[PDB]
Amino acid sequence: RKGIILAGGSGTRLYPVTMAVSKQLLPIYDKPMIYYPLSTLMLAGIRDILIISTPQDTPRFQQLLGDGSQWGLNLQYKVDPSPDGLAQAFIIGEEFIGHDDCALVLGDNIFYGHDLPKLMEAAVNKSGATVFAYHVNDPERYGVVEFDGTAVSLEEKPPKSNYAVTGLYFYDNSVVEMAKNLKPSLEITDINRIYMEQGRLSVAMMGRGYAWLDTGTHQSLIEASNFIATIEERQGLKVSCPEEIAFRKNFINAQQVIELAGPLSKNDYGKYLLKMVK
Amino acid sequence: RKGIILAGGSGTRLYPVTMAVSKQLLPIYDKPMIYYPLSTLMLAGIRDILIISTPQDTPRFQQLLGDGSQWGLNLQYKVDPSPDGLAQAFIIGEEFIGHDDCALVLGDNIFYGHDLPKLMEAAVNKSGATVFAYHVNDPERYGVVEFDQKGTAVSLEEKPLQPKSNYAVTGLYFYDNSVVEMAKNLKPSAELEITDINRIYMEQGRLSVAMMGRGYAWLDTGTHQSLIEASNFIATIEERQGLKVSCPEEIAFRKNFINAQQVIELAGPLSKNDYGKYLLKMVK
Amino acid sequence: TRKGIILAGGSGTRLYPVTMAVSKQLLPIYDKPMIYYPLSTLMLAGIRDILIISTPQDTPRFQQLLGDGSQWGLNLQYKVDPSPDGLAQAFIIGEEFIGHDDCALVLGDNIFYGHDLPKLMEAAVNKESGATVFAYHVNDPERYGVVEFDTAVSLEEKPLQPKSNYAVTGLYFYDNSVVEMAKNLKPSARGELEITDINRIYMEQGRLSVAMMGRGYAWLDTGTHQSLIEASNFIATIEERQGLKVSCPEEIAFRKNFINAQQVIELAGPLSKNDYGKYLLKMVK
Amino acid sequence: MKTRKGIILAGGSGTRLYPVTMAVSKQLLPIYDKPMIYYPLSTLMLAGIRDILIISTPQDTPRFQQLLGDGSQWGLNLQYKVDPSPDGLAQAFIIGEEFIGHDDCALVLGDNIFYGHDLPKLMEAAVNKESGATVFAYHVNDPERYGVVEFDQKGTAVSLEEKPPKYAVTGLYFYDNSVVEMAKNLKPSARGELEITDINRIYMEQGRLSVAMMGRGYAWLDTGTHQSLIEASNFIATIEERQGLKVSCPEEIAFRKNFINAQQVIELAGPLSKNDYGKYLLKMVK
Ligand SMILES: Nc1nc2c(ncn2[C@H]2C[C@H](O)[C@@H](COP(=O)(O)OP(=O)(O)OP(=O)(O)O)O2)c(=O)[nH]1
Ligand SMILES: Nc1nc2c(ncn2[C@H]2C[C@H](O)[C@@H](COP(=O)(O)OP(=O)(O)OP(=O)(O)O)O2)c(=O)[nH]1
Ligand SMILES: Nc1nc2c(ncn2[C@H]2C[C@H](O)[C@@H](COP(=O)(O)OP(=O)(O)OP(=O)(O)O)O2)c(=O)[nH]1
Ligand SMILES: Nc1nc2c(ncn2[C@H]2C[C@H](O)[C@@H](COP(=O)(O)OP(=O)(O)OP(=O)(O)O)O2)c(=O)[nH]1
Ligand SMILES: [Mg+2]
Ligand SMILES: [Mg+2]
Ligand SMILES: [Mg+2]
Ligand SMILES: [Mg+2]
Ligand SMILES: [Mg+2]
């Protein structure tokens, strides 16, 4: 079970807060933005993860995350000169991927939903690819998919559907070859169409009960932070807390939780971890 | 007119968001935290500013702020090995300060108030020192000052298990040149303490207190909680009252540190969001 | 046979001046009057016959809002009380309404949220005998009824030295024997028939279960201006980000087949100038 | 004599707000810690207006009286008139002809919330205008939804388009005595309503309409929906908590303008002593 996190980009819409800080290290309430797409991968049972970022920020991620062994993970890093193409992920990560299937998630994508893990299990347990769709109200702004669970149409910023394609994708090994033989528009949407034309593209539907934030602007960033702070405070759970997820899925034990909770013992984050482990 | 911004520290209460990012580069809504104490200095007419930070973060501030010439400022930088003592600021910055008076502001202090500039003018136009007091509800947690009617300080208790006032001392201070010598001859506490320096001035009857009461906001960005409160406050004021708080480009323009053409060039890289657009609207 | 009581009186004096001319339980929690929440909680437990107890002055205001509840497939009845002390006085005022049946009791300003709350409530309804109270973790047990459980072990109303972090919430399930308990109950020191006394009695008899609302559950008390705006923010946030409504009686009545799509559409008519009416139309297609 | 007078329009159905307005008047809904009507009322107080007519529905008018009384507790004279909800906001000057008499008159909508350090100065100017009318304009981003005004540099209005866009006209107006006669000789609009906009145009055609500009630093909330209601509440809670002041607190305003003294403040603060509202008032008087 392998996955890739795309954690580069400029976040230019976010100036000036991204002038000296990577977008994916901005706080979403009490956690760095990257904790979220990472937790999404952990929740799907993915433990070997390649993080692709900029030359300048990649060291910052390593300082934050290390090799991920503290959480029972294997984290690797690859710098890209940020040449256009999100589908370039499968090229940069060809070695990492090898012969295995692969999930891909954007570093600024925030997913929430009690049933997301089941949805992701199905996508892992699939040949072909699974994309995740989310009902929006402004399909024009997003890649739109129209589906049967099999995809019918795919229009990058059209609207034949209310469903936007999200930044979470599941591929079988054949994607690496697709990416390598892909003509520049390198677009993930093109790759996804290919699968659809082959009748190998399923669509996981995230409807009522799911939240999906894109952290485009200052506005959505503060809305995301307010959402996480609200859910956590009112419903007594943490969202995308890697230590908690690592513990609940037995990637690590209570003793390791306690050691990790040490440096966090000055705030509610460390305390929550101690409560949890008793 | 000179000032110092203390922008180091660990921000350990803020783990894990400060593990790989300096506290003073965290966003307060649409701006890096350091824009705020910096704007406070600009609003007092201070244009020559020394930023003291850590070895690791100082480069990050330079990448963000440069030499400040884009805003009509002169920004200099000094790394400190973070040896205990906030009053060590006057020692690290002895050369920078020279013979001039000096203001000092903490990098995580966020001040808001229509009349703050007038308050700061008075402090700049003073011998002695001016501290800024803010009415709190839990004086026990803060350095507390009890002052006279003339504005002269009477008492100074760093975290009084027994408070004599509701007024906390904030992280904004104005000193005359004599502070450099005070700092140099200061005995370490049970750290070189800004509170000790402030007492010295008070014992000399040279310490005024600027009062920030009704209409003023003062946020300390201690925790995750206060950080999200600070961000919500800024977003709310800005959206409902159509003004920006602590926007250096706007302040630079309004005080003629720069002209409209320079504003427009700066607004270019920001044109994908409301920040850039606000700056263009402003210059027409 | 499934019956419930909503306590919707009181002064809400902490809430002056907003409660000077408006009942606390008619204050908006985002897009709904406060009373929709505890009412929906009852509906979710399958309770359809509900007695609303309130003040002389406000009872008419509730009736104007809610009617007899037939629009939602319910039977709502009303009883005015002179606010004689005692929340446990509910079982006395409602003795006739209750008759021989079991009974649930909810406070008019209690707001419960949780995907699994309905299952929790099913279990409490399906309890042959005894009572079920609902516990929630609070950081200041001192101002709440405090429970310690195995079946309950200890109960203290506003304990100076609380023995646990678990507050007893304003949602209770009783068997028919509660009416007699209430009638033979001695007023407490403050001169009030106390729900906590009643709950202790059940516990002393080894008949008191505790439903635990832990991770995933929200419980708001609308004590102050602060908590009121927090509750509203919570509801607005959940609804907007997760595309569901919390405690929307029309939705609940439809999903549990108390009413059909045609009735939903008629009810959605007067609400068609806002998202609430539109949500109901979307729902029914 | 010349009496500063004002009218608050506090009826309507608030149908956009169902179901929260099914059994509660819109203007009694809380905006954070105060009934909605405290805000437009405070706006009037801040302009020195102390004689105020509150026009509302048959059903709600008693609820306002229970809340506000005759206003003497705050140094005011409040009077009430119930209208059958007949078409026309400009009908205010007809219903209130007797109340107004020979005086000038301000008019404010019961769901309008104004905030701004300098609002009082703006309002002083409008009260001190010897003749004509003053409307208050607010820069919006969607002029197409609001009455729009286009004005000169002197401050004189040029154009007035009810939902055009050539600045929205807000629900705060200042008139001289001549408005009563304008209202009485006004023809109903196409929707059969006596329109404040028609009245305002008349003044403009006469070159007697000034425009007070509320730009940077001013907030204006309309409490149209559930959304704006919770935004207004958040705004008031935020400003109050972060900046240590209350917005549109009548007791505070009455005290600061000497409508009442410290002893009267303390008596009023008594029933509010279980919350921060009562405590704020006690702190204030020491
Ligand atoms: N490794 C890498 N990742 C990228 C690059 N561009 C974007 N990403 C990541 C960042 C996001 O998490 C995700 C897509 O987000 P966006 O494209 O909206 O972020 P971007 O940095 O472009 O923000 P911006 O469009 O400048 O406002 O992919 C890139 O050139 N290289
Ligand atoms: N240059 C420098 N600045 C510092 C140092 N410690 C704190 N500061 C700055 C950071 C703050 O803006 C201000 C005082 O804030 P704090 O002491 O609460 O920040 P600190 O990083 O200690 O956070 P923490 O106490 O670890 O939660 O002074 C230091 O060792 N060196
Ligand atoms: N029928 C009736 N219901 C009441 C009475 N007192 C309180 N309730 C309701 C209102 C609440 O929904 C629930 C308990 O809430 P509270 O006792 O905190 O409300 P209360 O009106 O006392 O607010 P306050 O204590 O004045 O701030 O029981 C009463 O005297 N009669
Ligand atoms: N006395 C009186 N006042 C009214 C009437 N209609 C509206 N108002 C007040 C209520 C508001 O504070 C102000 C204008 O607000 P709106 O017309 O948006 O409130 P309305 O109740 O019509 O809300 P709605 O349009 O039904 O969503 O004038 C009325 O028929 N009679
Ligand atoms: Mg992009
Ligand atoms: Mg600090
Ligand atoms: Mg209560
Ligand atoms: Mg209307
Ligand atoms: Mg309106």
Side-chain angles (χ1 to χ4, degrees):
Chain A
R1 301 201 174 205
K2 296 179 181 177
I4 294 174
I5 300 175
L6 284 181
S10 285
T12 59
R13 266 177 293 182
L14 292 178
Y15 287 158
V17 310
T18 42
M19 280 181 66
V21 180
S22 169
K23 183 183 188 179
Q24 288 85 21
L25 289 176
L26 299 177
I28 299 304
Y29 181 41
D30 69 336
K31 301 172 210 60
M33 184 188 293
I34 199 180
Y35 275 25
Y36 300 82
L38 182 54
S39 294
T40 300
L41 293 188
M42 302 177 61
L43 283 172
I46 298 170
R47 288 213 197 187
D48 292 292
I49 300 171
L50 172 66
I51 294 182
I52 305 177
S53 192
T54 65
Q56 174 189 200
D57 293 310
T58 294
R60 284 299 172 140
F61 293 115
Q62 294 176 313
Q63 173 182 15
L64 166 68
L65 298 172
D67 58 30
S69 53
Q70 70 274 19
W71 298 335
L73 310 178
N74 178 24
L75 303 179
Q76 294 176 66
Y77 298 83
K78 282 220 78 179
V79 170
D80 81 301
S82 292
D84 295 315
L86 267 51
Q88 194 181 339
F90 308 107
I91 293 175
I92 302 169
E94 168 171 31
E95 179 173 1
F96 162 86
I97 293 164
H99 301 300
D100 291 285
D101 294 331
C102 205
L104 172 67
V105 66
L106 307 188
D108 65 4
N109 264 225
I110 301 170
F111 298 87
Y112 177 84
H114 186 290
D115 292 309
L116 188 67
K118 295 191 203 66
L119 233 32
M120 286 187 307
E121 196 58 41
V124 169
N125 291 334
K126 205 193 172 202
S127 77
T130 310
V131 289
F132 286 72
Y134 191 78
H135 190 332
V136 294
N137 290 330
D138 39 330
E140 61 295 349
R141 322 208 307 94
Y142 296 138
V144 178
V145 56
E146 169 188 4
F147 56 70
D148 199 352
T150 49
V152 179
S153 180
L154 240 346
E155 304 186 338
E156 186 73 346
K157 309 180 182 181
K160 316 217 158 216
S161 182
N162 282 314
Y163 289 61
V165 179
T166 64
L168 176 62
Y169 322 82
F170 288 81
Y171 302 111
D172 67 13
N173 192 194
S174 73
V175 67
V176 181
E177 205 56 26
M178 288 188 197
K180 280 154 69 190
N181 306 342
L182 193 57
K183 278 301 182 174
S185 68
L186 302 174
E187 304 287 30
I188 197 59
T189 320
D190 289 332
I191 275 165
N192 297 333
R193 189 173 295 100
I194 293 171
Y195 273 99
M196 178 186 42
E197 285 164 5
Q198 305 172 348
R200 302 167 62 210
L201 186 64
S202 305
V203 173
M205 185 177 58
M206 299 179 297
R208 182 170 56 105
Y210 287 92
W212 173 55
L213 302 122
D214 210 334
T215 49
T217 58
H218 299 201
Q219 227 57 49
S220 54
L221 200 73
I222 195 179
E223 278 168 13
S225 290
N226 284 321
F227 170 71
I228 300 304
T230 297
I231 297 316
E232 295 203 351
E233 181 170 11
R234 301 257 80 73
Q235 287 175 326
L237 70 141
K238 297 189 66 63
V239 177
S240 292
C241 173
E243 293 89 354
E244 174 176 49
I245 296 173
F247 180 61
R248 307 301 202 180
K249 299 176 75 56
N250 303 296
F251 298 173
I252 63 175
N253 63 49
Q255 296 294 101
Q256 302 164 285
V257 173
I258 292 159
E259 304 203 350
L260 298 171
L264 304 158
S265 72
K266 277 167 158 278
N267 64 46
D268 288 347
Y269 194 134
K271 282 148 198 168
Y272 177 97
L273 295 182
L274 297 172
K275 284 174 179 272
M276 165 189 75
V277 104
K278 82 176 176 58
Chain B
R1 299 201 176 206
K2 294 180 181 175
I4 294 177
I5 301 172
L6 283 182
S10 287
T12 62
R13 268 176 294 182
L14 292 177
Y15 290 157
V17 311
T18 41
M19 279 182 67
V21 181
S22 169
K23 182 185 188 178
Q24 286 88 23
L25 290 178
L26 297 177
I28 299 304
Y29 180 42
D30 70 338
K31 303 174 207 57
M33 184 184 298
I34 198 179
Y35 277 24
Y36 300 81
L38 180 55
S39 296
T40 299
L41 291 189
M42 302 176 60
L43 283 171
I46 299 168
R47 290 213 198 186
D48 292 293
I49 300 172
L50 170 68
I51 297 182
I52 305 176
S53 191
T54 66
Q56 174 190 201
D57 292 311
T58 295
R60 286 298 172 145
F61 293 116
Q62 293 177 317
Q63 171 181 17
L64 164 69
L65 299 171
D67 59 30
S69 53
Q70 71 274 21
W71 299 333
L73 313 176
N74 178 25
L75 303 179
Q76 295 176 64
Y77 298 83
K78 283 220 76 179
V79 172
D80 80 301
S82 292
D84 294 316
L86 294 214
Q88 194 182 340
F90 310 105
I91 294 175
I92 302 170
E94 168 172 31
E95 179 174 0
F96 161 86
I97 292 164
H99 301 301
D100 291 286
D101 295 331
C102 202
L104 173 66
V105 65
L106 307 186
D108 65 7
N109 264 226
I110 300 175
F111 299 86
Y112 177 83
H114 185 289
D115 293 309
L116 191 61
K118 295 193 203 64
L119 234 31
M120 288 187 306
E121 197 57 42
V124 169
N125 293 334
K126 205 191 173 202
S127 78
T130 310
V131 291
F132 286 72
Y134 191 76
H135 191 331
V136 295
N137 289 331
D138 39 331
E140 355 12 301
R141 322 208 306 94
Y142 296 137
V144 179
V145 58
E146 168 188 5
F147 56 70
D148 200 353
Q149 183 186 356
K150 301 193 234 344
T152 51
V154 180
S155 179
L156 266 158
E157 305 185 338
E158 185 74 345
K159 309 180 183 180
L161 308 182
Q162 288 131 12
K164 317 217 157 216
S165 180
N166 282 315
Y167 289 60
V169 180
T170 63
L172 174 63
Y173 320 84
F174 287 81
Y175 302 110
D176 68 15
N177 191 196
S178 73
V179 69
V180 182
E181 205 55 26
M182 289 188 199
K184 278 155 69 190
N185 306 342
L186 193 56
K187 278 301 182 173
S189 71
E191 238 193 332
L192 300 173
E193 303 288 30
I194 196 59
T195 319
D196 287 333
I197 275 165
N198 295 334
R199 188 172 296 100
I200 292 171
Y201 273 100
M202 178 187 42
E203 285 165 6
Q204 306 173 348
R206 302 166 62 212
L207 184 67
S208 306
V209 174
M211 185 174 59
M212 304 176 295
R214 183 168 55 105
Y216 287 93
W218 174 55
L219 297 298
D220 210 332
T221 51
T223 58
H224 300 202
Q225 226 57 48
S226 51
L227 202 71
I228 195 178
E229 279 167 10
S231 292
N232 286 320
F233 170 73
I234 301 305
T236 294
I237 296 315
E238 295 205 350
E239 180 169 12
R240 300 259 78 75
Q241 291 173 322
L243 72 140
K244 299 186 67 63
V245 178
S246 294
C247 177
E249 296 89 349
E250 171 175 51
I251 296 173
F253 180 63
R254 305 302 201 180
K255 297 177 77 54
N256 303 294
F257 298 173
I258 63 173
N259 62 48
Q261 295 293 101
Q262 303 164 285
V263 171
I264 291 159
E265 304 205 349
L266 298 170
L270 303 159
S271 74
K272 279 167 157 278
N273 67 46
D274 288 349
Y275 194 133
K277 284 145 198 170
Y278 177 95
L279 297 183
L280 299 170
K281 284 174 179 271
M282 165 190 77
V283 288
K284 81 177 177 58
Chain C
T1 194
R2 301 201 174 204
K3 294 181 180 174
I5 294 174
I6 303 175
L7 281 184
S11 285
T13 61
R14 268 177 296 180
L15 291 178
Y16 290 159
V18 311
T19 42
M20 280 181 64
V22 183
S23 169
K24 183 183 186 176
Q25 287 88 21
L26 295 175
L27 299 178
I29 299 305
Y30 181 44
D31 67 338
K32 304 174 208 59
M34 187 186 293
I35 197 177
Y36 275 25
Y37 301 82
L39 177 61
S40 295
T41 300
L42 291 192
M43 298 173 67
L44 285 170
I47 298 166
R48 290 210 196 191
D49 293 290
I50 303 173
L51 167 72
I52 293 180
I53 302 179
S54 193
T55 64
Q57 174 190 19
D58 292 309
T59 294
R61 284 301 169 143
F62 297 115
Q63 294 178 313
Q64 169 182 196
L65 169 67
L66 299 169
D68 59 29
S70 54
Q71 72 273 20
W72 299 334
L74 312 176
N75 178 26
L76 305 176
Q77 293 177 66
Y78 298 84
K79 282 220 79 178
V80 170
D81 80 302
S83 275
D85 309 295
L87 294 215
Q89 194 183 339
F91 309 105
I92 293 175
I93 300 165
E95 167 172 30
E96 176 176 1
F97 163 84
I98 292 165
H100 302 300
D101 292 287
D102 293 334
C103 205
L105 173 65
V106 68
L107 305 188
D109 63 4
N110 268 225
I111 300 173
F112 298 90
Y113 177 83
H115 186 289
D116 293 308
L117 188 67
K119 294 192 204 65
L120 234 32
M121 288 185 309
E122 196 59 41
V125 171
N126 292 335
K127 207 193 172 202
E128 211 169 339
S129 73
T132 310
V133 290
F134 285 73
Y136 197 84
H137 186 316
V138 303
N139 292 3
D140 55 338
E142 309 79 22
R143 62 182 186 92
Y144 291 105
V146 173
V147 61
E148 169 187 3
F149 57 70
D150 199 352
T151 52
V153 181
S154 180
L155 282 164
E156 303 175 39
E157 182 62 15
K158 298 183 177 68
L160 288 182
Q161 296 193 355
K163 302 186 171 184
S164 183
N165 274 325
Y166 288 78
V168 177
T169 67
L171 176 65
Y172 321 83
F173 288 80
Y174 301 111
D175 67 14
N176 189 21
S177 73
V178 71
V179 181
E180 205 57 25
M181 289 187 195
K183 279 155 69 192
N184 306 340
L185 193 57
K186 276 303 183 173
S188 73
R190 57 163 179 192
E192 238 193 330
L193 304 171
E194 302 288 28
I195 197 59
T196 320
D197 287 333
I198 272 162
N199 295 333
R200 189 174 294 99
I201 292 170
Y202 274 98
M203 178 188 40
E204 284 164 6
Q205 305 172 348
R207 299 168 64 211
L208 185 65
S209 310
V210 175
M212 185 176 58
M213 301 175 294
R215 182 170 55 105
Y217 286 91
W219 174 57
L220 302 124
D221 212 332
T222 50
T224 60
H225 300 199
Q226 227 57 48
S227 48
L228 201 74
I229 195 182
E230 277 170 10
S232 291
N233 285 322
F234 172 74
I235 303 305
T237 295
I238 297 317
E239 295 204 353
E240 179 172 11
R241 300 262 77 75
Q242 293 170 319
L244 59 328
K245 299 188 66 60
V246 176
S247 298
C248 171
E250 294 88 352
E251 173 175 49
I252 293 168
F254 180 62
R255 307 301 202 179
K256 299 178 74 56
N257 304 293
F258 299 172
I259 63 174
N260 62 47
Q262 297 292 104
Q263 304 165 287
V264 172
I265 290 156
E266 307 208 347
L267 300 170
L271 302 160
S272 72
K273 280 166 155 278
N274 64 47
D275 291 347
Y276 192 135
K278 285 143 199 171
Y279 178 96
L280 298 180
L281 298 170
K282 284 171 179 272
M283 163 188 78
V284 106
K285 83 177 175 58
Chain D
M1 68 155 294
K2 215 179 171 182
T3 308
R4 301 198 174 205
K5 294 183 182 174
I7 294 173
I8 301 178
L9 285 182
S13 283
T15 61
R16 267 177 294 181
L17 291 178
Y18 287 161
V20 314
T21 43
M22 280 181 65
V24 181
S25 169
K26 181 185 188 178
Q27 287 89 19
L28 291 176
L29 298 177
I31 299 304
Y32 182 46
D33 68 339
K34 301 175 208 64
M36 188 186 292
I37 200 179
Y38 273 28
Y39 301 82
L41 177 59
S42 290
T43 301
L44 292 192
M45 296 174 68
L46 282 171
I49 298 168
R50 291 210 198 190
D51 292 289
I52 300 170
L53 171 68
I54 292 181
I55 304 178
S56 193
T57 67
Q59 174 190 19
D60 293 308
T61 292
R63 286 298 168 146
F64 295 115
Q65 292 175 313
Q66 170 182 196
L67 167 69
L68 299 169
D70 58 30
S72 56
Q73 70 275 18
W74 297 335
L76 311 176
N77 177 24
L78 304 178
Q79 292 177 67
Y80 297 82
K81 283 218 80 181
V82 177
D83 80 304
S85 297
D87 287 337
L89 266 50
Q91 193 181 339
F93 309 105
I94 294 172
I95 302 169
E97 167 172 31
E98 176 174 2
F99 161 84
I100 293 162
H102 302 302
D103 291 284
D104 294 331
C105 205
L107 173 67
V108 67
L109 308 187
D111 66 5
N112 266 227
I113 301 170
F114 299 87
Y115 177 82
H117 187 290
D118 293 309
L119 187 66
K121 295 191 204 65
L122 270 184
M123 289 187 304
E124 196 59 42
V127 169
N128 291 334
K129 208 193 170 202
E130 10 199 9
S131 75
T134 310
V135 290
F136 284 72
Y138 190 78
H139 190 331
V140 294
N141 289 331
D142 39 329
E144 97 196 343
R145 323 207 306 94
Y146 295 139
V148 178
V149 59
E150 168 188 3
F151 56 71
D152 199 352
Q153 183 185 356
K154 301 193 234 344
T156 50
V158 179
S159 177
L160 266 157
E161 304 186 339
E162 186 73 346
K163 309 181 182 179
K166 317 216 159 216
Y167 287 63
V169 181
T170 67
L172 176 62
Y173 318 85
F174 289 78
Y175 301 111
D176 68 13
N177 191 20
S178 73
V179 69
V180 181
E181 204 56 26
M182 289 186 197
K184 277 155 70 191
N185 307 339
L186 192 58
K187 278 302 183 173
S189 69
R191 55 199 174 110
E193 241 192 328
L194 302 173
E195 303 288 29
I196 197 57
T197 319
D198 288 334
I199 273 163
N200 296 334
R201 189 173 294 100
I202 292 171
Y203 273 98
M204 177 190 39
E205 285 165 5
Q206 304 173 347
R208 300 167 66 212
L209 186 63
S210 307
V211 173
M213 185 176 59
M214 298 179 296
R216 181 170 57 105
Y218 286 91
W220 175 53
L221 302 125
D222 210 331
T223 50
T225 59
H226 299 202
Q227 226 57 48
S228 51
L229 201 74
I230 194 184
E231 281 169 8
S233 292
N234 286 323
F235 172 70
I236 301 301
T238 295
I239 298 315
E240 294 203 354
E241 178 170 13
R242 300 262 77 77
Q243 292 171 319
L245 57 329
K246 299 189 64 64
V247 179
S248 297
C249 177
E251 295 91 352
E252 174 175 50
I253 295 171
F255 180 63
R256 309 299 203 181
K257 300 179 71 60
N258 304 293
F259 299 172
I260 63 174
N261 62 47
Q263 298 293 103
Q264 303 164 289
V265 169
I266 290 158
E267 307 204 349
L268 299 170
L272 302 160
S273 72
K274 282 166 156 277
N275 64 44
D276 289 348
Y277 196 135
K279 282 145 200 169
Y280 179 95
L281 295 184
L282 297 170
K283 284 171 178 273
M284 163 189 79
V285 288
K286 81 177 177 59

